[PDB]
Nucleic acid binder design. Structure first.
Length: 94
DNA sequence: GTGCCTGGAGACTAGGGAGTAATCCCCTTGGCGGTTAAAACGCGGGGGACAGCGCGTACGTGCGTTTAAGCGGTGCTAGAGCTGTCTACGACCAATTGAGCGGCCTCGGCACCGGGATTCTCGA
């Protein structure tokens, strides 16, 4: 039995950015609630936008428009930068 | 550090969406005149925004007192999972039917338009 969390990945990216910093468990649960909340926000907005575009699939175009909707524009263009980086580094399926 | 359980990774075969030909085609964007109700310039003002004073009171602050109330223990008590075991239980493709849309035709009070009766001016 387990509960799905992202404390290991948060600690990994935090030590990757700055290894000389720590984080307690209460703030870890707060950030886990935060990432589940924004995942719920983006997923429901993408489902709304897919149902509005007469298309019952989820591509990356709806996610791009959804992160252009709810995120601010500097974070929106940084998010499309990170997303294009993720697709271009994932497409090399060798 | 150490670790075993299990979601993660992934190729092959049916099987349903994507955007490129294609063509209507309706809505729109752009401009010319007019005319008109609304936008703009100005001018005297007076009524409402604003500074200041009178005051008194009620909260800023401090002190005796109670007053729950917090920290720590632990049994009492009764509410939250998990694996079996069985029952329902909502969907899949297909013939038949249906009931609300595409475009058509009929009423009906509101505003405009004319006569019957009444009132005003003159004539007979």
């Amino acid at each position: 039995a387990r509960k799905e969390t992202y404390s290991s990945y948060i600690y990994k990216v935090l030590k990757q950015t700055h290894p000389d910093t720590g984080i307690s468990q209460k703030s870890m649960s707060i950030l886990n609630s935060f990432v589940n909340d924004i995942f719920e926000r983006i997923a429901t907005e993408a489902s709304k936008l897919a149902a509005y575009n007469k298309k019952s699939t989820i591509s990356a175009r709806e996610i791009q428009t959804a992160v252009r909707l709810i995120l601010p524009g500097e974070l929106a263009k940084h998010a499309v930068s990170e997303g294009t980086r993720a697709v271009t580094k994932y497409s090399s399926s060798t």
